[PDB]
């Protein structure tokens, strides 16, 4: 079973969050990966769960999961890349919020 506080390595960037935050959006990729019905998920050299995506963009994914909204730094030049990340994580609402 997963621990209360999950430690994630996303593309090299380390994030900590509650397990409930990872199953926050029903039917999303993280919902499947972290729903208790673990040993399928890859791990880095220090035993952290590894997510093979851009670690810098994930910071906004996580904020969505926390707040159902995202504030982007001013003049953010990668709205489209973050949109693709949302598509990969199967977060439809976020995909719509980032639609140009």
UniProtKB/Swiss-Prot annotation:
Record-listed Phosphotyrosine modification sites: 88
Top-level taxonomic group: Eukaryota
Locations listed in the record: Presynaptic cell membrane; Postsynaptic cell membrane
Domain BTB stretches: 4-74
Coiled coil: none
Assembly information from the UniProt record: Homopentamer; forms an open pentamer. In contrast to other BTB domain-containing proteins, does not interact with CUL3. Interacts as a tetramer with GABRB1 and GABRB2.
Function per UniProt: Auxiliary subunit of GABA-B receptors that determine the pharmacology and kinetics of the receptor response. Increases agonist potency and markedly alter the G-protein signaling of the receptors by accelerating onset and promoting desensitization.
Protein name: BTB/POZ domain-containing protein KCTD16
Organism of derivation: Homo sapiens
Gene: KCTD16
């Amino acid at each position: 079973s997963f621990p209360e506080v999950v430690e994630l390595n996303v593309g090299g960037q380390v994030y900590f969050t509650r397990h409930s935050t990872l199953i926050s959006i029903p039917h999303s990729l993280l919902w499947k990966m972290f729903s208790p019905k673990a040993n399928d998920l890859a791990k880095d050299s220090k035993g952290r769960f590894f997510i093979d995506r851009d670690g810098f963009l994930f910071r906004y994914i996580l904020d969505y999961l926390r707040d159902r909204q995202v504030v982007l730094p001013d003049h953010f030049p990668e709205k489209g890349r973050l949109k693709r990340e949302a598509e990969y994580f199967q977060l439809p609402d976020l995909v719509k919020l980032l639609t140009p």
